[PDB]
Design a protein around this ligand. Structure first.
Ligand SMILES: NC(=O)c1ccc[n+]([C@@H]2O[C@H](COP(=O)([O-])OP(=O)(O)OC[C@H]3O[C@@H](n4cnc5c(N)ncnc54)[C@H](O)[C@@H]3O)[C@@H](O)[C@H]2O)c1
Ligand SMILES: NC(=O)c1ccc[n+]([C@@H]2O[C@H](COP(=O)([O-])OP(=O)(O)OC[C@H]3O[C@@H](n4cnc5c(N)ncnc54)[C@H](O)[C@@H]3O)[C@@H](O)[C@H]2O)c1
Ligand SMILES: NC(=O)c1ccc[n+]([C@@H]2O[C@H](COP(=O)([O-])OP(=O)(O)OC[C@H]3O[C@@H](n4cnc5c(N)ncnc54)[C@H](O)[C@@H]3O)[C@@H](O)[C@H]2O)c1
Ligand SMILES: NC(=O)c1ccc[n+]([C@@H]2O[C@H](COP(=O)([O-])OP(=O)(O)OC[C@H]3O[C@@H](n4cnc5c(N)ncnc54)[C@H](O)[C@@H]3O)[C@@H](O)[C@H]2O)c1
Ligand SMILES: Cc1ccccc1Oc1ccc(Cn2cc(-c3ccccc3)nn2)cc1O
Ligand SMILES: Cc1ccccc1Oc1ccc(Cn2cc(-c3ccccc3)nn2)cc1O
Ligand SMILES: Cc1ccccc1Oc1ccc(Cn2cc(-c3ccccc3)nn2)cc1O
Ligand SMILES: Cc1ccccc1Oc1ccc(Cn2cc(-c3ccccc3)nn2)cc1O
Ligand SMILES: [Cl-]
Lengths: 268, 262, 268, 268
C-alpha cells in the first residue's frame, strides 16, 4: 500500500511547518512510515509544530554540536521505536551558518570560528549522526541528507556553499561506512523552498537586498527548470527523499539526486 | 497498490530474457503497470520471450532507423491501448554499435559510416522516440533511457562511449521539449549486467575482470552483474510519481561505484 | 624566446580574420612557431586571409569529410615542412551543423542525415585528424581542439551541443592513442567569440530572434565571469590554445581547459 | 624562455626539497620570477632548504592560523619587495590534517576539533591569504592553490578529501573577490608526488599500510594516465603552476587544472 509501509525512520530538522523536514515527515507518514523525530533548542515550539503532522511521533532532543546528545542518541532512539527494533531510515535536514558567513557580509570577513561552527552543523554532523545510528539500522536501510548544489559559486550563499561542498564529500565517505551495514547514503539537492532558514538566515544576511533574493532564485530555478519550480511547494522534495528511503532506489549510494525541476541540467 | 498502478507504459528493447528491458517490464507489471512492448527485427523470438513476462502485453514492431515505423508508432500504440487513452511512461532500452566501433578493434579504424549508425540507434533515437510519443503522453508522465557512464574513457567500449555522451546531451534537450507536455526525461546509468549486447562488445575473462574492478570492487554496497532487478527498480522509480522534480538528469544505479575512486 | 620557439604546428579552421584559428595562428607566430595551415572549400579567400598573418605559412586543402584528403594529409604536411621534420602541434578549430539542427528550428525536426553530417565534421574529425597526423608528431607534442561547454542544455545551440558532447568523449579516446606517441590531446572550451559560424550559423538559425543570441551570451558569460568576457577579443582564447601547445602544461591530457572568464564556475 | 620575467611571486609551503612548493619556486626562478617565500614553524630548517634554490629570496614567517601573521603579511611582503612594488603571483601550497583524520583511523572517530584544524589550514587559509595579499597584487595577477581531486571518495585520504572539497568551493568564491582586482584564482589538482605530507597520510614511510599506499597510487595514477605518471618528479606540476602564474591562461579563473597525466579522464 504505502511506499514506506512498516519502515521506522528518524527525521531531524523540523523547526516550523515550512521546514523541509516537516514535509518529509508528513509524506513519510502518509506512506505508512513510523517516525521518530529530533529537534534542536526550541523543543516546546517543535512539539506544537509536530502536532500538526498526520500522526503522533516521539520527539527527541538533538543538538548535533553536543557530544552527550550524540553519545545517548542510539539509546534514546531504541527506547522510542521499541527495544530491539531497528531503523530503516535516517533523514539529516539540518544546517546553520552564522550571519558573517552569508549575504552581503564580505566573504573574506567571516572569521574561521564562525565558518567552523557552520561546517560542524551542516557537514560534519552528517557523519556524526551516521556514526551514532548505523549500529541500529537494518540492512537495506537508507540515510538521506539535504544539499543545495554548490558546484558553482553564487551570490549570498557564500560560506554555506563551502559547507555543502564539504557535505557532499562527507556523504561519499559515509557511504563507504554504511555499505558495511547494507545501508545507503545519499543527498537530495533540492531547489529553493521558502523556509525559516531561507528567510532569516540567508534573507536576513542580505539586509536590504532580500527583494533581489526572490528574483535570483526565480532566475536560477524556475526559469531554467524544464518542468518549472515552485518555491512554496515542498512536496516534490519530500517525495524525492521518500523515494530514497524506499526500496525503489536500491543501487544508488554515495550519490546526489537533484530535486530541482531539472534546473541544474540547463544553462539558461 | 503497486508503484505503477494504473499507468500505461511503453517498453522498447527486449530481445532475450536477460535484456534490461525484460526486467524493467517484469518489475513494471509486478507493480501494476499495463505495458505496450516494442521489438526490433526478430519479432518471433521476441514474442516467445515476452510470453515469459508475468502478463500479456501487445508487441509492436519498431526499428528506430525506419521513418515509417516512427511515423505510424503513435497510431499503433493508440490502437493497442484504446482510443482516448494515453501513455504515462516510455522506456528507451536500445543500443547498437558495429563491431568496428568496439572491443579490440583500434579506435581510429572505425569508419564514420559505422559510428554514425551506432549514434543513430543509440542516441538520436531517444529524440525520435520522444518526438513520436510525446503527443500521446499524459501530463505527469516519464521518459526513461539507459546510459552507461561515459564521463571517462575506458577499454573496449570505444565509440559506444561516444554514443552515450551524445545520448546524455540529447536527454537534456528532450527534457526541454518534454517539459511543455508536463513530462520528465531522464537516464539511468546502470552498472554492468550480463546481456546479449554485453557479450557482443568483445566476442571475455579480461572483460569480466575489468567490470569487477570498475564496479563491484568500487561499489560500497557491491554490484552483481547477474541481477538486473536493482536496475529495473530504479527505472520504475523514475516512471513513478516519486521523482516528480527530476528531469534532464541521470540517476546512477551502479552500487555507488562512480562515487568511489578506488 | 617565444613560447613556441622552434615548434612546427598545424592549424586548421581559418575562414576569416575573425576565426578563432586565425588568432591562434597569429599568436603562435608571434611566439616563434612555424605554421602549416589547412583550409576548407574557399581556398582562394583563405589564402588572402592568411596573408594578413604576421608570417607566410603554407596552406593545404582539407575537407575532413574527404577520405582522400585525410589519407594524403601527412604526406602533404611532410612535403611542406621538409622530409625528416615532424609536427609538434595540431590545432582542430573546425565545426559545422546544418540549419535544421540549430536556432529556432525545432530540435525534434532535425533529420538524422543533417545531425550526422554535423557530428562527422565537428566531432569524428577530431579523431580522423589525430589518426592522420600522429605518425608525423614528435614526442612531447600536443593536439588541441575547440569546445563550447555542452554539460547543460541551452537555447539555440541544439544539436551542436550534442556534437560537442561527442567531441569531449572523442578527446578522451584520442588521448589514449596519442599517449603511445608521447603526445597530449586536450580541448579548450572557449567563451563566445564573434566569428562567421557564431553569426551566420547560430545567429542565422535564429531568424528574427537574433537579438536573443546576444542577450543569452551576455547573461551566460560576461555577467557570470569574475574577470569579465569580451566576445570581440579572441586573444585570451588564442593564448590559452598556445599554452596547451607549449611545454608548460606537460601533465594535462584527455582534458578540457576553460577559457571563458570563469563563467562556467559561477551560477549567476 | 623567461615565462615569468619581471614577475614578483609569493610562494608558501616549502618545508623540504621534496615539497611541491620547492619545485614551484625553483621553476619560477628559472623562468625569471623574483620570489618572496613563506614558511611555517621551522624557519631555520626552511632557510637551509631554500638556500638550495637557484636564487636567494627573502623568507617570511607565516602560520595561517595566526591572525597577527596574516594581518602583518602585506606590510612584511612590501618591505621585502620594496615600497611601490606589488605582487603578480601568490602560491598556496599548504595543508594539514591531524592523524585521526587520515589513514587507517576510522573515518567516524576523527573528532571535529581535529577535522576543523585541518579545514582551517587546508581550505579556509586559501581565503585568508587572498584577503591579506589582494591589496598588494597588480591587475593581471594570479593566485594558485594545490588540490588533490576529491570528487570521489577513496581509502586513507579521509577527512583531507573533505578539506579539498571545501577548498574547491573556496577557490570559486576567491575568484569572485579577486576579479575586482583583475586577479585570477585557480587550483592545480596534481597527481601524487612523494613528499613529507604524503608519508604522513599513513603515519610515516613505514606506516602500517604504506605498501597499500604505493599500490593504490600506482593504480589510480600511473596506470590510468595516458602519458604515465612519475611520483618522484614534481617538475610537471611546478610547470603547470607557472603556466597559471603567467599571462598564458588569461581567461581561466575560479577553476581547476589537472596535472595528473590525464588519469582523472580514464576509468581504468
Ligand atoms: N530551503 C531551501 O531552499 C533549501 C534547499 C536545499 C537544501 N536545503 C537544506 O535543507 C535542510 C533543512 O533546511 P530548511 O530549508 O528546511 O530550513 P529550516 O530552518 O526549516 O530547518 C533547518 C534546521 O536545522 C536545525 N539545526 C540548526 N542547528 C542545529 C543543531 N545544532 N543541531 C541540530 N539541528 C540543528 C534547525 O533546528 C532547523 O530545524 C538544510 O540542510 C538546508 O541547508 C534547503
Ligand atoms: N548490460 C549492461 O551492462 C548495460 C549497462 C548500462 C546501460 N546499458 C544499456 O541498456 C540498454 C539495453 O541494453 P542491454 O544491455 O539490455 O542489451 P540487449 O542486447 O538486451 O538489448 C539491446 C536492445 O537494442 C535493440 N535495438 C538495436 N538496434 C535497434 C533498432 N534499430 N531499433 C530498435 N531496437 C534496436 C535490440 O533489438 C535489443 O532489444 C542499452 O541502451 C544499453 O547500452 C547496458
Ligand atoms: N566562436 C565561438 O564563440 C566559439 C566558442 C567555442 C568554441 N568554438 C568552436 O571553435 C571552432 C572554430 O569556429 P569559429 O567560431 O572560429 O568559426 P569559423 O566559422 O571561423 O570557423 C569554423 C571553421 O570550420 C571549418 N569547417 C567547416 N566544415 C569543414 C570541413 N568539412 N572540413 C574542414 N573544415 C571545415 C570552416 O571552414 C571554418 O574555417 C569550432 O569548433 C567552434 O565550434 C567557437
Ligand atoms: N604530494 C602530493 O601528492 C600532493 C598532491 C596534490 C596536492 N597536494 C597538495 O600540495 C600542497 C603541498 O603539500 P606537499 O605534498 O608539498 O607537502 P609538504 O609537507 O611538503 O608541504 C606542506 C606544507 O604545509 C605547510 N603548513 C602546514 N601547516 C601550516 C600552517 N599552519 N601555516 C602555513 N603553512 C603550513 C608545511 O609547513 C609544509 O610546508 C598541499 O595543499 C597538498 O595537499 C599534494
Ligand atoms: C539551514 C540553512 C542554514 C544556513 C544557510 C541556509 C540554510 O538552508 C537553506 C535555505 C535556503 C537555500 C536556498 N537559497 C539559496 C539562496 C542564495 C541567495 C539567493 C541566490 C541563490 C543563493 N537563497 N535561498 C539553501 C539552504 O541551504
Ligand atoms: C546495447 C549495446 C549496444 C552496443 C554496445 C553495448 C550495448 O549495451 C551494453 C552492454 C554492456 C555494457 C556494460 N559493459 C561495458 C563493457 C566494456 C568492457 C569492460 C570495461 C568497461 C567497458 N563491457 N560491458 C554497456 C552497454 O551499453
Ligand atoms: C563552427 C560552428 C559550427 C556550427 C555551430 C557553431 C559553431 O561554432 C560556434 C560559434 C559560436 C559559439 C558560441 N555561441 C553559442 C551560442 C548559442 C546562443 C546563445 C546562448 C548559447 C548558445 N551563440 N554563440 C559556439 C560555437 O561552437
Ligand atoms: C599536505 C597534506 C596534509 C595532509 C594530507 C595530505 C597532504 O598533502 C598531500 C600529500 C599527498 C597526496 C597524495 N596522496 C594521496 C594518498 C591517499 C592514499 C593512497 C590512495 C589515494 C589517497 N596518498 N598520497 C595528497 C595530498 O593532499
Ligand atoms: Cl509533487
Amino acid at each position: 500500500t504505502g511506499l514506506l509501509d512498516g519502515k521506522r525512520i528518524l527525521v531531524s530538522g523540523i523547526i516550523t511547518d515550512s521546514s523541509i523536514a516537516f514535509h518529509i515527515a508528513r509524506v513519510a507518514q502518509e506512506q505508512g512510515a513510523q517516525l521518530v523525530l529530533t529537534g534542536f533548542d526550541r523543543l516546546r515550539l517543535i512539539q506544537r509544530i509536530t502536532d500538526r503532522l498526520p500522526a503522533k511521533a516521539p520527539l527527541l532532543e538533538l543538538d548535533v554540536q553536543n557530544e552527550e546528545h550524540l553519545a545517548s542518541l542510539a539509546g534514546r532512539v531504541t527506547e522510542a521505536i521499541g527495544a530491539g527494533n531497528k531503523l530503516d531510515g535516517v533523514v539529516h535536514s539540518i544546517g546553520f551558518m552564522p550571519q558573517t558567513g552569508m549575504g552581503i557580509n564580505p566573504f573574506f570577513d567571516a572569521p574561521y570560528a564562525d565558518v567552523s561552527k557552520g561546517i560542524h552543523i551542516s557537514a560534519y554532523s552528517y557523519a556524526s549522526m551516521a556514526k551514532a545510528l548505523l549500529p541500529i539500522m537494518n540492512p537495506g536501510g537508507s540515510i538521506v541528507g539535504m544539499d543545495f548544489d554548490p558546484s558553482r559559486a553564487m551570490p549570498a550563499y557564500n560560506w554555506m556553499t563551502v559547507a555543502k561542498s564539504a557535505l557532499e564529500s562527507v556523504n561519499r565517505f559515509v557511504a563507504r561506512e554504511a555499505g558495511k551495514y547494507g545501508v545507503r547514503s545519499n543527498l537530495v539537492a533540492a531547489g529553493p523552498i521558502r523556509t525559516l532558514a531561507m528567510s532569516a538566515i540567508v534573507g536576513g544576511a542580505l539586509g536590504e537586498e532580500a527583494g533581489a533574493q526572490i528574483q535570483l532564485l526565480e532566475e536560477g530555478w524556475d526559469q531554467r527548470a524544464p518542468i518549472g519550480w515552485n518555491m512554496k511547494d515542498a512536496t516534490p522534495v519530500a517525495k524525492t527523499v521518500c523515494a530514497l528511503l524506499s526500496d525503489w532506489l536500491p543501487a544508488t549510494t554515495g550519490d546526489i539526486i537533484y530535486a530541482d525541476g531539472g534546473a541544474h541540467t540547463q544553462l539558461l
